[PDB]
Amino acid sequence: MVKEFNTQTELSVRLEALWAVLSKDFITVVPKVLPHIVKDVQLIEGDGGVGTILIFNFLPEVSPSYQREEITEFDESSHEIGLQVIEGGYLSQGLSYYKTTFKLSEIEEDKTLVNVKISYDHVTPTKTSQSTLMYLRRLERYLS
Ligand SMILES: C/C(=C\CNc1ncnc2[nH]cnc12)CO
Ligand SMILES: C/C(=C\CNc1ncnc2[nH]cnc12)CO
Ligand SMILES: C/C(=C\CNc1ncnc2[nH]cnc12)CO
């Protein structure tokens, strides 16, 4: 059955700057901040927001060589974005279901809380969450 893993991190960045890169401007950023993992990101379908489909192409040494993700939730007013893996990635490594939901909140002008919810069924969320948190901290440094 689908289980959940929740974690969070506070980043030293403005909410709106983090929201823009997280939710919309990530296509050139992911390969720049995860160059050991992601070769490029392709927009497959959609124009942003719900129903958008993405391909993440990994480095040649990586198997599976890609992951297909879909934006399943998008809410500007609450700064929430959810992405479901629909092909490849962790689904090729024993997961039957995998979704990541990010929610941003303002703590102070230059401090933003990121809540991370991973929904999964069957590679553990303890480990996969570390990768997701590393990505978030990399967005903080990109923006700083
Ligand atoms: C494009 C975005 C995230 C890309 N997807 C993932 N980003 C970070 N950790 C993950 N684990 C599985 N899928 C992901 C939001 O900027
Ligand atoms: C539709 C989205 C972004 C629009 N920007 C890009 N859309 C498509 N290809 C790209 N290459 C670099 N930036 C882009 C994701 O919200
Ligand atoms: C299953 C694999 C990678 C999992 N996906 C991700 N792993 C780490 N950071 C990411 N950003 C976007 N997608 C990812 C390839 O071994």
Side-chain angles (χ1 to χ4, degrees):
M1 291 298 180
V2 175
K3 293 171 284 287
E4 294 187 359
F5 183 102
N6 292 282
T7 188
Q8 65 189 62
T9 189
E10 301 178 0
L11 302 180
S12 286
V13 291
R14 300 254 303 264
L15 188 135
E16 281 302 312
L18 182 59
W19 180 242
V21 65
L22 187 68
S23 73
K24 301 309 223 141
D25 298 338
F26 53 81
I27 288 179
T28 69
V29 177
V30 177
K32 285 176 175 282
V33 304
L34 304 177
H36 58 290
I37 304 177
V38 177
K39 180 166 183 50
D40 64 63
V41 184
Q42 307 295 320
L43 179 66
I44 308 308
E45 159 201 338
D47 49 329
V50 180
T52 301
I53 301 178
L54 309 163
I55 288 277
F56 296 78
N57 286 297
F58 302 133
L59 306 187
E61 278 352 277
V62 181
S63 33
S65 71
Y66 71 95
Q67 95 191 355
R68 194 185 301 273
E69 283 196 313
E70 184 169 355
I71 301 182
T72 52
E73 152 85 44
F74 193 101
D75 191 75
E76 195 96 357
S77 68
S78 58
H79 304 101
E80 188 166 48
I81 183 167
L83 294 101
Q84 181 174 9
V85 177
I86 62 166
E87 190 192 347
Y90 297 140
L91 299 183
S92 302
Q93 297 181 325
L95 284 287
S96 63
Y97 187 93
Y98 196 89
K99 183 186 291 197
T100 309
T101 304
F102 299 90
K103 175 175 317 174
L104 307 184
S105 54
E106 181 167 52
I107 299 335
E108 304 178 354
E109 173 158 352
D110 293 319
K111 295 183 178 176
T112 302
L113 179 63
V114 189
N115 289 279
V116 178
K117 182 185 297 153
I118 296 160
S119 299
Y120 66 100
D121 201 3
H122 286 92
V123 178
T124 67
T126 288
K127 181 88 188 355
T128 68
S129 67
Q130 292 174 308
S131 297
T132 300
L133 292 168
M134 179 166 58
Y135 168 61
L136 290 168
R137 296 192 204 92
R138 291 186 164 221
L139 298 181
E140 179 200 71
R141 301 203 288 297
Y142 177 102
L143 296 169
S144 298

PDB file of all heavy atoms in Angstrom, residues 20 23-29 41-43 45-49 52 54 71 74 81, ligand 2:
ATOM      1  N   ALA A  20      10.134  30.108  -8.105  1.00  0.00           N
ATOM      2  CA  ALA A  20      10.336  30.212  -9.538  1.00  0.00           C
ATOM      3  C   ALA A  20      11.232  29.101 -10.025  1.00  0.00           C
ATOM      4  O   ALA A  20      10.912  28.459 -11.052  1.00  0.00           O
ATOM      5  CB  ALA A  20      10.896  31.577  -9.901  1.00  0.00           C
ATOM      6  N   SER A  23       9.524  25.470  -9.483  1.00  0.00           N
ATOM      7  CA  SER A  23       8.267  25.174 -10.086  1.00  0.00           C
ATOM      8  C   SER A  23       8.240  25.376 -11.564  1.00  0.00           C
ATOM      9  O   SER A  23       7.402  24.768 -12.241  1.00  0.00           O
ATOM     10  CB  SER A  23       7.093  25.983  -9.447  1.00  0.00           C
ATOM     11  OG  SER A  23       7.128  27.352  -9.825  1.00  0.00           O
ATOM     12  N   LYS A  24       9.111  26.220 -12.135  1.00  0.00           N
ATOM     13  CA  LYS A  24       8.982  26.646 -13.506  1.00  0.00           C
ATOM     14  C   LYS A  24      10.301  26.748 -14.248  1.00  0.00           C
ATOM     15  O   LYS A  24      10.374  26.478 -15.449  1.00  0.00           O
ATOM     16  CB  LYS A  24       8.274  28.010 -13.573  1.00  0.00           C
ATOM     17  CG  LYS A  24       6.887  28.090 -12.983  1.00  0.00           C
ATOM     18  CD  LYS A  24       5.965  27.014 -13.475  1.00  0.00           C
ATOM     19  CE  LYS A  24       4.572  27.453 -13.823  1.00  0.00           C
ATOM     20  NZ  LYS A  24       4.111  26.728 -15.066  1.00  0.00           N
ATOM     21  N   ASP A  25      11.385  27.214 -13.611  1.00  0.00           N
ATOM     22  CA  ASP A  25      12.613  27.544 -14.302  1.00  0.00           C
ATOM     23  C   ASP A  25      13.702  26.496 -14.215  1.00  0.00           C
ATOM     24  O   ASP A  25      14.873  26.753 -14.468  1.00  0.00           O
ATOM     25  CB  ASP A  25      13.134  28.912 -13.808  1.00  0.00           C
ATOM     26  CG  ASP A  25      12.225  30.083 -14.059  1.00  0.00           C
ATOM     27  OD1 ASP A  25      11.357  29.999 -14.964  1.00  0.00           O
ATOM     28  OD2 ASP A  25      12.373  31.134 -13.353  1.00  0.00           O
ATOM     29  N   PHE A  26      13.321  25.253 -13.868  1.00  0.00           N
ATOM     30  CA  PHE A  26      14.261  24.234 -13.522  1.00  0.00           C
ATOM     31  C   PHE A  26      14.946  23.552 -14.715  1.00  0.00           C
ATOM     32  O   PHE A  26      15.906  22.812 -14.480  1.00  0.00           O
ATOM     33  CB  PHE A  26      13.587  23.150 -12.666  1.00  0.00           C
ATOM     34  CG  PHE A  26      12.342  22.588 -13.302  1.00  0.00           C
ATOM     35  CD1 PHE A  26      12.358  21.630 -14.282  1.00  0.00           C
ATOM     36  CD2 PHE A  26      11.065  23.075 -12.949  1.00  0.00           C
ATOM     37  CE1 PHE A  26      11.236  21.172 -14.859  1.00  0.00           C
ATOM     38  CE2 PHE A  26       9.936  22.626 -13.510  1.00  0.00           C
ATOM     39  CZ  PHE A  26       9.988  21.670 -14.529  1.00  0.00           C
ATOM     40  N   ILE A  27      14.495  23.756 -15.942  1.00  0.00           N
ATOM     41  CA  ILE A  27      14.968  22.876 -17.043  1.00  0.00           C
ATOM     42  C   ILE A  27      16.447  23.026 -17.271  1.00  0.00           C
ATOM     43  O   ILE A  27      17.161  22.027 -17.445  1.00  0.00           O
ATOM     44  CB  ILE A  27      14.160  23.093 -18.349  1.00  0.00           C
ATOM     45  CG1 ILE A  27      12.746  22.511 -18.169  1.00  0.00           C
ATOM     46  CG2 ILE A  27      14.878  22.555 -19.560  1.00  0.00           C
ATOM     47  CD1 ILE A  27      11.730  22.568 -19.208  1.00  0.00           C
ATOM     48  N   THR A  28      17.009  24.265 -17.285  1.00  0.00           N
ATOM     49  CA  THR A  28      18.473  24.423 -17.407  1.00  0.00           C
ATOM     50  C   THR A  28      19.162  24.237 -16.063  1.00  0.00           C
ATOM     51  O   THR A  28      20.419  24.043 -16.046  1.00  0.00           O
ATOM     52  CB  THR A  28      18.900  25.757 -17.990  1.00  0.00           C
ATOM     53  OG1 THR A  28      18.597  26.812 -17.031  1.00  0.00           O
ATOM     54  CG2 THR A  28      18.183  26.044 -19.273  1.00  0.00           C
ATOM     55  N   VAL A  29      18.475  24.337 -14.969  1.00  0.00           N
ATOM     56  CA  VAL A  29      19.105  24.351 -13.629  1.00  0.00           C
ATOM     57  C   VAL A  29      19.417  22.972 -13.145  1.00  0.00           C
ATOM     58  O   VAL A  29      20.527  22.768 -12.597  1.00  0.00           O
ATOM     59  CB  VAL A  29      18.250  25.143 -12.634  1.00  0.00           C
ATOM     60  CG1 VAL A  29      18.863  25.097 -11.259  1.00  0.00           C
ATOM     61  CG2 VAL A  29      18.006  26.576 -13.114  1.00  0.00           C
ATOM     62  N   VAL A  41      17.190  17.819 -19.234  1.00  0.00           N
ATOM     63  CA  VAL A  41      15.746  17.699 -18.979  1.00  0.00           C
ATOM     64  C   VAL A  41      15.003  18.116 -20.239  1.00  0.00           C
ATOM     65  O   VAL A  41      15.291  19.179 -20.812  1.00  0.00           O
ATOM     66  CB  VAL A  41      15.298  18.568 -17.784  1.00  0.00           C
ATOM     67  CG1 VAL A  41      13.832  18.355 -17.465  1.00  0.00           C
ATOM     68  CG2 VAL A  41      16.164  18.326 -16.571  1.00  0.00           C
ATOM     69  N   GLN A  42      14.067  17.307 -20.679  1.00  0.00           N
ATOM     70  CA  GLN A  42      13.226  17.562 -21.849  1.00  0.00           C
ATOM     71  C   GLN A  42      11.774  17.776 -21.418  1.00  0.00           C
ATOM     72  O   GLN A  42      11.217  17.008 -20.665  1.00  0.00           O
ATOM     73  CB  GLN A  42      13.280  16.418 -22.842  1.00  0.00           C
ATOM     74  CG  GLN A  42      14.719  16.054 -23.247  1.00  0.00           C
ATOM     75  CD  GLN A  42      15.376  17.190 -24.002  1.00  0.00           C
ATOM     76  OE1 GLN A  42      14.744  17.867 -24.834  1.00  0.00           O
ATOM     77  NE2 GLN A  42      16.628  17.378 -23.715  1.00  0.00           N
ATOM     78  N   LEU A  43      11.150  18.794 -21.978  1.00  0.00           N
ATOM     79  CA  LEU A  43       9.730  19.008 -21.886  1.00  0.00           C
ATOM     80  C   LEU A  43       9.038  18.195 -22.914  1.00  0.00           C
ATOM     81  O   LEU A  43       9.320  18.318 -24.154  1.00  0.00           O
ATOM     82  CB  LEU A  43       9.459  20.528 -22.029  1.00  0.00           C
ATOM     83  CG  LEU A  43       7.965  20.882 -21.982  1.00  0.00           C
ATOM     84  CD1 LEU A  43       7.403  20.584 -20.639  1.00  0.00           C
ATOM     85  CD2 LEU A  43       7.786  22.343 -22.357  1.00  0.00           C
ATOM     86  N   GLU A  45       5.413  17.206 -22.825  1.00  0.00           N
ATOM     87  CA  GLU A  45       4.021  17.548 -23.044  1.00  0.00           C
ATOM     88  C   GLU A  45       3.645  18.623 -22.016  1.00  0.00           C
ATOM     89  O   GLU A  45       4.187  18.626 -20.890  1.00  0.00           O
ATOM     90  CB  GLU A  45       3.111  16.321 -22.876  1.00  0.00           C
ATOM     91  CG  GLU A  45       1.689  16.703 -22.590  1.00  0.00           C
ATOM     92  CD  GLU A  45       0.867  15.614 -21.933  1.00  0.00           C
ATOM     93  OE1 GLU A  45       1.276  14.426 -22.088  1.00  0.00           O
ATOM     94  OE2 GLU A  45      -0.158  15.936 -21.277  1.00  0.00           O
ATOM     95  N   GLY A  46       2.712  19.500 -22.349  1.00  0.00           N
ATOM     96  CA  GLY A  46       2.254  20.498 -21.434  1.00  0.00           C
ATOM     97  C   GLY A  46       3.079  21.788 -21.511  1.00  0.00           C
ATOM     98  O   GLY A  46       4.061  21.859 -22.255  1.00  0.00           O
ATOM     99  N   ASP A  47       2.664  22.768 -20.744  1.00  0.00           N
ATOM    100  CA  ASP A  47       3.265  24.087 -20.766  1.00  0.00           C
ATOM    101  C   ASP A  47       3.564  24.562 -19.355  1.00  0.00           C
ATOM    102  O   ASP A  47       3.713  25.793 -19.153  1.00  0.00           O
ATOM    103  CB  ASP A  47       2.333  25.131 -21.426  1.00  0.00           C
ATOM    104  CG  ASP A  47       0.904  25.077 -20.855  1.00  0.00           C
ATOM    105  OD1 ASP A  47       0.481  23.977 -20.466  1.00  0.00           O
ATOM    106  OD2 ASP A  47       0.260  26.136 -20.817  1.00  0.00           O
ATOM    107  N   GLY A  48       3.668  23.616 -18.420  1.00  0.00           N
ATOM    108  CA  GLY A  48       3.892  24.060 -17.029  1.00  0.00           C
ATOM    109  C   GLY A  48       2.653  23.820 -16.225  1.00  0.00           C
ATOM    110  O   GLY A  48       1.546  23.659 -16.775  1.00  0.00           O
ATOM    111  N   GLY A  49       2.794  23.569 -14.917  1.00  0.00           N
ATOM    112  CA  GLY A  49       1.586  23.152 -14.177  1.00  0.00           C
ATOM    113  C   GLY A  49       1.108  21.770 -14.505  1.00  0.00           C
ATOM    114  O   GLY A  49       1.736  20.931 -15.195  1.00  0.00           O
ATOM    115  N   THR A  52       1.967  18.459 -17.106  1.00  0.00           N
ATOM    116  CA  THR A  52       3.232  18.581 -17.780  1.00  0.00           C
ATOM    117  C   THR A  52       4.042  17.285 -17.576  1.00  0.00           C
ATOM    118  O   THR A  52       4.087  16.764 -16.433  1.00  0.00           O
ATOM    119  CB  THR A  52       4.035  19.776 -17.217  1.00  0.00           C
ATOM    120  OG1 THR A  52       3.227  20.951 -17.420  1.00  0.00           O
ATOM    121  CG2 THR A  52       5.361  19.893 -17.907  1.00  0.00           C
ATOM    122  N   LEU A  54       7.883  15.515 -18.190  1.00  0.00           N
ATOM    123  CA  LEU A  54       9.300  15.751 -18.289  1.00  0.00           C
ATOM    124  C   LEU A  54      10.061  14.443 -18.459  1.00  0.00           C
ATOM    125  O   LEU A  54       9.677  13.465 -17.840  1.00  0.00           O
ATOM    126  CB  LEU A  54       9.831  16.444 -17.034  1.00  0.00           C
ATOM    127  CG  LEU A  54       9.065  17.701 -16.592  1.00  0.00           C
ATOM    128  CD1 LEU A  54       9.403  18.031 -15.180  1.00  0.00           C
ATOM    129  CD2 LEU A  54       9.384  18.803 -17.602  1.00  0.00           C
ATOM    130  N   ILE A  71       3.942  16.386 -13.625  1.00  0.00           N
ATOM    131  CA  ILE A  71       3.466  17.304 -12.587  1.00  0.00           C
ATOM    132  C   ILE A  71       2.001  16.967 -12.284  1.00  0.00           C
ATOM    133  O   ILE A  71       1.150  17.119 -13.151  1.00  0.00           O
ATOM    134  CB  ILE A  71       3.611  18.784 -12.982  1.00  0.00           C
ATOM    135  CG1 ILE A  71       5.081  19.160 -13.287  1.00  0.00           C
ATOM    136  CG2 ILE A  71       2.977  19.683 -11.944  1.00  0.00           C
ATOM    137  CD1 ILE A  71       5.389  20.585 -13.635  1.00  0.00           C
ATOM    138  N   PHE A  74      -0.147  21.343  -8.609  1.00  0.00           N
ATOM    139  CA  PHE A  74       0.500  22.635  -8.776  1.00  0.00           C
ATOM    140  C   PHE A  74      -0.419  23.659  -8.181  1.00  0.00           C
ATOM    141  O   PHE A  74      -1.534  23.878  -8.653  1.00  0.00           O
ATOM    142  CB  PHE A  74       0.761  22.843 -10.233  1.00  0.00           C
ATOM    143  CG  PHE A  74       1.692  23.990 -10.556  1.00  0.00           C
ATOM    144  CD1 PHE A  74       3.023  23.741 -10.878  1.00  0.00           C
ATOM    145  CD2 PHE A  74       1.269  25.305 -10.526  1.00  0.00           C
ATOM    146  CE1 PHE A  74       3.888  24.781 -11.172  1.00  0.00           C
ATOM    147  CE2 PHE A  74       2.110  26.329 -10.815  1.00  0.00           C
ATOM    148  CZ  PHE A  74       3.424  26.075 -11.117  1.00  0.00           C
ATOM    149  N   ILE A  81       3.999  21.922  -5.267  1.00  0.00           N
ATOM    150  CA  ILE A  81       4.180  21.264  -6.517  1.00  0.00           C
ATOM    151  C   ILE A  81       4.484  19.755  -6.203  1.00  0.00           C
ATOM    152  O   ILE A  81       5.325  19.457  -5.402  1.00  0.00           O
ATOM    153  CB  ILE A  81       5.286  21.880  -7.421  1.00  0.00           C
ATOM    154  CG1 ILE A  81       5.328  21.127  -8.786  1.00  0.00           C
ATOM    155  CG2 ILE A  81       6.632  21.952  -6.789  1.00  0.00           C
ATOM    156  CD1 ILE A  81       6.119  21.814  -9.839  1.00  0.00           C
TER     157      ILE A  81
HETATM  158  C1  LIG B   2       7.036  24.691 -19.361  1.00  0.00           C
HETATM  159  C2  LIG B   2       8.207  24.895 -18.415  1.00  0.00           C
HETATM  160  C3  LIG B   2       9.308  25.731 -18.682  1.00  0.00           C
HETATM  161  C4  LIG B   2       9.510  26.535 -19.914  1.00  0.00           C
HETATM  162  N1  LIG B   2      10.934  26.603 -20.204  1.00  0.00           N
HETATM  163  C5  LIG B   2      11.484  25.621 -21.003  1.00  0.00           C
HETATM  164  N2  LIG B   2      10.658  24.918 -21.769  1.00  0.00           N
HETATM  165  C6  LIG B   2      11.201  24.063 -22.697  1.00  0.00           C
HETATM  166  N3  LIG B   2      12.486  23.874 -22.977  1.00  0.00           N
HETATM  167  C7  LIG B   2      13.259  24.623 -22.200  1.00  0.00           C
HETATM  168  N4  LIG B   2      14.652  24.670 -22.207  1.00  0.00           N
HETATM  169  C8  LIG B   2      14.988  25.622 -21.250  1.00  0.00           C
HETATM  170  N5  LIG B   2      13.975  26.182 -20.670  1.00  0.00           N
HETATM  171  C9  LIG B   2      12.838  25.547 -21.251  1.00  0.00           C
HETATM  172  C10 LIG B   2       8.177  24.142 -17.051  1.00  0.00           C
HETATM  173  O1  LIG B   2       7.192  24.955 -16.329  1.00  0.00           O
END
